[PDB]
Design a protein around this ligand. Structure first.
Ligand SMILES: Cc1cc2nc3c(=O)[nH]c(=O)nc-3n(C[C@H](O)[C@H](O)[C@H](O)COP(=O)(O)OP(=O)(O)OC[C@H]3O[C@@H](n4cnc5c(N)ncnc54)[C@H](O)[C@@H]3O)c2cc1C
Ligand SMILES: Cc1cc2nc3c(=O)[nH]c(=O)nc-3n(C[C@H](O)[C@H](O)[C@H](O)COP(=O)(O)OP(=O)(O)OC[C@H]3O[C@@H](n4cnc5c(N)ncnc54)[C@H](O)[C@@H]3O)c2cc1C
Ligand SMILES: O=c1ccn([C@@H]2O[C@H](COP(=O)(O)OP(=O)(O)O[C@H]3O[C@H](CO)[C@@H](O)[C@H](O)[C@H]3O)[C@@H](O)[C@H]2O)c(=O)[nH]1
Ligand SMILES: O=c1ccn([C@@H]2O[C@H](COP(=O)(O)O)[C@@H](O)[C@H]2O)c(=O)[nH]1
Lengths: 383, 383
């Protein structure tokens, strides 16, 4: 028996769930308030340069979950690509994340791995036993100079607060790699969709039982035309923000076009507070199998997220976490609806994780129909 | 009709020719003077640490030839591997090949790509119309400072000649990059066999029609027994070294074991002429997908190849080329033999070129059989 399903959101959560159920004969109506599919994964070609631009910022696919990998490889050709971030600070260019080259270069040393462990352990401020603040967990770990060169200015720009004002919980691990691997990611699978995420998600969306409507807001009154609703909009918004708006950072992108090769890599972080942007991305560097004479770039600014802005990074400190609980209690008393996604559950989720969660959510729903059981409102842990 | 074929050597040359013909029902006899297959591509595991060691030097597969790439993929699982060489000189660690990071670290700048073109154009001497020596190539494009830091000392050790005495082509090959790409090789296909080259070659050898006798020197009187001989041993040796030995450089690999990560990367170049070894290689890093606690490393020394040393790099100057001619003129007066490979033809050949050439030579013999025409001594250019 074919169910009627409303899915709010045409990003990965909406699409993957939609496709899983379309394949099992359900009638899937997917809507999105924006004027294009893809959610925050959307890319598109700038007309003047033909560069495939990541519209909502750099989106690097990476995963250790082969099921997910095989799954996207059904909808795109993945090109190999490894993210290699550079950072400009103190009149030098370094590689990130902090590795043996960063350390040698920064200190003008010629350390082996072990020698560099020793060198970092001397630099570490153990003149403080129970580090409380982010400022003091870094200072314990990597010492004043590195903390001040690579962390303090960046954190302030990205989070809008002094690392003294932030908790030690943020930095669980000593942020140094004691080898020369400068790949940003450790995952088994990494790459970039040859024709981009918009095409990949378009492919996922291509089934007879899926209808997409764009420029289309969710309205609660619609709920009753459907057997089930998957909502990948913001949890707070669903409830009229009745208890207040969940905290995010937002990003502004200042686009410019450079005629040539503007910086020579995909992402150049700027660690200094006195540089008002957080980083510059040169988008053509994400498609290295293509060549373009004209380059699209983005200066990236981080701000507090306000009512008219797109939300990016969830803040998830004590106030925001207490606020989320109140919305959770509302959600748990709900009936033909499941909340999913970065926005529906107030978490930061990579693409690969989002896809894994969407496949599972579909699976649970499908099993709910056959076993005659209630569909849960959340398919992952949310507390 | 099933021809009886003798092949001298079980490296790539021998293996691939053997396998192409076995598959055409020929009875192929492959001898090698060593007690194992693989030629200088041979890798094996160290007892103590279990690190897979590249016995005759680290061997990285790289090709723009899709056919060859497909070919070896029939016989091994190729893991992607990108070679990122570091270099120690002047109390610092740098990345090679020369790129934007190298230029910015060496001269203490934060240039954009265009600013780096300008900086290096002012350092080079565009008054040199046509660089003929290694030194001239370097002075023309990279300038005195980069030349002397990274190339002069290293080149003096590798070749045992002043760079004014060496051909420009040696340097001509290497990327001077004005972006942050530090991939040592341009080639589209680049990787390492998951199970190593010995297994890969084993598999090429593993046909019903192929018998392999190890610890077995070639003897001239065997020729009579076969319809054709493929010889991948040294050409001068085939002729009793009757005119002198072809000029080579040899390498001494000095092994040591470290409990930990010794340098943190596969290859560390030592560019100073006052450091005696040319490089240190840490072999576990060639298998990034494996984990090992102990590490096998090699300090690597270059010196003139003598009588009992293994030949690695052919010198190929006017003298060695005169000498080669003498051996060429004897080889041309042979009837049922084709000399192949780096040793058989006195050329430096990368694995992929070796294999393409083997593929071709096997093709040329099969073509010649059908058209009852004589099989030549060389299927490739050498005079
Ligand atoms: C700055 C940034 C960088 C990132 N970089 C990476 C990366 O490099 N690699 C990686 O793997 N992941 C990255 N991510 C995460 C990635 O963006 C997410 O995993 C992905 O967006 C999740 O897709 P989703 O569909 O669940 O949510 P979304 O993409 O956010 O889609 C939600 C959709 O629902 C729509 N919607 C919301 N409310 C309504 C409504 N009420 N009515 C109708 N439609 C509505 C929105 O228009 C939106 O399209 C990054 C995230 C951010 C913020
Ligand atoms: C230091 C070094 C590093 C290299 N690194 C790379 C690299 O990174 N990537 C790459 O693509 N290529 C590399 N190469 C080249 C690579 O080693 C060759 O492509 C490959 O070895 C060619 O194989 P072959 O079968 O033609 O010759 P070989 O591998 O030399 O095989 C010849 C075989 O013939 C046997 N033999 C010789 N004479 C006799 C005889 N009289 N009787 C019986 N047996 C005999 C030998 O025992 C040997 O096993 C490197 C080469 C060197 C020297
Ligand atoms: O730091 C360097 C590196 C290279 N060169 C010069 O450039 C030439 C060519 O260099 P390269 O591309 O490294 O070829 P080789 O050094 O001859 O080959 C070795 O080094 C390569 C880089 O890791 C490996 O792929 C090969 O297997 C190994 O034989 C050298 O002979 C040198 O004269 C330098 O002067 N300094
Ligand atoms: O090189 C670095 C690494 C991390 N961080 C800060 O640490 C936070 C989380 O650390 P991690 O555990 O995600 O690396 C990031 O948001 C950022 O504020 C930096 O400023 N510089």
């Amino acid at each position: 028996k074919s169910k009627k399903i409303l899915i709010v959101g045409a990003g990965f959560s909406g699409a993957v769930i939609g496709r899983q159920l379309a394949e099992k004969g359900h009638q899937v109506h997917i809507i999105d308030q924006r004027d294009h599919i893809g959610g925050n994964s959307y890319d598109a070609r700038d007309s003047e340069t033909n560069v495939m631009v990541h519209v909502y910022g750099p989106h690097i696919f990476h995963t250790d979950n082969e099921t997910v990998w095989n799954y996207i490889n059904k909808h795109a050709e993945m090109m190999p690509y490894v993210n290699r971030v550079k950072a400009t600070v103190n009149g030098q260019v370094f590689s990130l994340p902090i590795n043996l080259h960063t350390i040698n270069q920064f200190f003008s040393k010629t350390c082996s791995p072990d020698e560099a462990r020793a060198l970092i352990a001397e630099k570490g401020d153990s003149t403080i036993a129970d580090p409380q603040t982010f400022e003091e967990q870094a200072l314990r770990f990597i010492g004043k100079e590195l903390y001040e060169a690579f962390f303090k200015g960046y954190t302030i720009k990205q989070w809008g607060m002094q690392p003294s004002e932030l908790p030690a919980s943020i930095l669980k691990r000593l942020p140094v790699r004691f080898n020369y691997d400068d790949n940003y990611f450790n995952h088994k699978f990494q790459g970039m969709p040859k024709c981009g995420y918009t095409q990949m998600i378009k492919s996922i969306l291509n089934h007879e039982n899926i209808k997409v409507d764009l420029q289309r807001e969710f309205i609660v009154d619609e709920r009753t035309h459907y057997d089930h609703v998957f909502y990948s909009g913001p949890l707070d918004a669903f409830y009229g923000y009745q208890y207040g708006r969940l905290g995010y950072r937002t990003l502004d992108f200042k686009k410019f076009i450079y005629q040539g090769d503007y910086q020579g890599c995909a992402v150049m972080n700027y660690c200094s507070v006195d540089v008002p942007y957080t980083r510059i991305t040169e988008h053509k560097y994400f498609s290295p199998w293509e060549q373009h004479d004209g380059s699209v770039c983005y200066k990236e600014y981080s701000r507090a997220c306000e009512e008219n802005d797109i939300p990016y990074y969830p803040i998830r400190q004590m106030g925001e976490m207490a606020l989320l609980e109140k919305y959770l209690s509302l959600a748990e008393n709900e009936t033909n609806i499941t909340f999913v996604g970065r926005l529906g559950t107030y978490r930061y989720l990579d693409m690969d994780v989002t896809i894994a969660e969407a496949l599972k959510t579909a699976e649970v729903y499908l099993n709910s129909l056959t076993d005659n059981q209630p569909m849960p409102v959340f398919t992952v842990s949310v507390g």
